């Protein structure tokens, strides 16, 4: 599996999609609501300015935390491998196979 | 010097038993008198 | 590089701000004015042309939200693809062990 | 005798570890540690040397190495044998004191070298060095000794200095060096490679008359230097540093 570092920065990342999601959302949710706050009835006028700011506090942060991430992009430069050693780990193997050949005992 | 090196010429070397050329030796005595005693050594390879 | 995105992500950022408070303004007095005094600029000249300004005004904001936010989820996967890939990072027991082996396959041969 | 291709740079030790993982990353290969103790020698000034033809200059008098191994029992102090034997020991190695002395390199007294100065123009994209050597096995007699030998010739000791690095083989006959030298002298060790590693690429040539081979040879180096664009600048060292002629002296290091 991938070392931790990679897992945080992926859900990081995922979070960020989301976010960006949920303020699409919100986008709607406000449109719809203008309609009606045209139309004439003022019950969902209180609805309008939590909505707003809602609006513009996920569409801030977002941005912000995708801005830390390029950040964190800056700072961690200098921060088939596997064949160097892929040969031995089969050898390995190998000869524990062999093992379980020459043990009658262990065949079952 | 290298680890690597090293590490190499040990693991090649662990198979030498089985890689190395097969010898046979085989010492006769024959009981012989007369404090004269022949020996006959005969050693069977496959070079 | 990096830097060009930080830029890119910028002027998308405030394309979306300038492009919110346009829409707005325009939804908001979508109600056309009319105002006698000569500071109130406000025009209505040719009746139909005013919905087709105001259908323009629609399909700019909504083709540029649109792209705008695909723009920006394409650019969140470009960092998290480079995130993957551009990251580069007894003897004697054997001895015995063969030795039963051949021995094993002498007398079995 | 070989015609030596070369190209040089240096890098300071903060990114040395990065550097190793990433040559690893293309040449596919591991880094090998290695040492080496070079000894120079020059003419005896006691002799007057009335034959170098002045009206004429057919030769110049010039300066000879003399290389051997030296095992790491002599580098290893006594806080390092837990320590594997292998790269990283060199991060240790960054202060100017040494375990080996000037008394045990006086006890020890090979390869024996000899070059000219690289081929003039500007239209050379590669350090082209010429290269005479020649290898010592053993010896015999009454004085038999290294010292004793070059006075025979006629050459007197004048300095020398210890090399540790890594090597690295790539495709090619291509040879990467990571190097960190170490003057000795009586009053002591000093550094000259102070808080760095000297970094050398180079290809040898056995024949120079073989021009396929010497085009060959120069683009596997250009493109090399075009691969670790961006990471560490790979250049043409001065014409005039590599000139070890006695009548003149200075010493690329």
Known sequence: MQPPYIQERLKSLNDIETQLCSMLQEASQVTFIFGELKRGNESVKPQFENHVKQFYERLDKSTTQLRKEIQLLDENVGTNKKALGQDTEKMEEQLDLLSAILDPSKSK | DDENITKLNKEIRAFDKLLNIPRRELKINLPLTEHKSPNLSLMLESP | ?109 | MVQQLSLFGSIGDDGYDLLISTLTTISGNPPLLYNSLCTVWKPNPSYDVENVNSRNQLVEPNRIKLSKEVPFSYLIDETMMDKPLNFRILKSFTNDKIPLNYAMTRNILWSLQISDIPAAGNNRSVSMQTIAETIILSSAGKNSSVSSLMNGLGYVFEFQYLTIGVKFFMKHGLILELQKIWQIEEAGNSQITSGGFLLKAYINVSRGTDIDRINYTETALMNLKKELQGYIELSVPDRQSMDSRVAHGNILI
Do not use: H
């Not at chain 3, 930080?6 to 979508?30: D, F, G």
């Not at chain 3, 000569?38 to 259908?55: H, I, K, R, W």
């Not at chain 3, 649109?66 to 996967?77: E, F, P």
């Open chain 3, 1 to 109: 590089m990096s830097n060009q995105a930080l830029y890119e992500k910028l002027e998308q950022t405030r394309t979306i701000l300038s492009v919110k408070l346009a829409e707005l303004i325009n939804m908001t007095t979508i109600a056309d004015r009319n105002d006698d005094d000569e500071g109130s600029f406000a025009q209505e000249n040719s009746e139909l042309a005013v919905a087709t300004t105001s259908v323009m005004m629609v399909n700019n904001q909504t083709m540029q939200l649109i792209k705008n936010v695909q723009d920006l989820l394409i650019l969140t996967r470009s960092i998290k693809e480079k995130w993957l890939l551009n990251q580069i990072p007894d003897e004697k027991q054997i001895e015995e062990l063969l030795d039963n082996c051949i021995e094993t396959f002498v007398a079995e041969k």
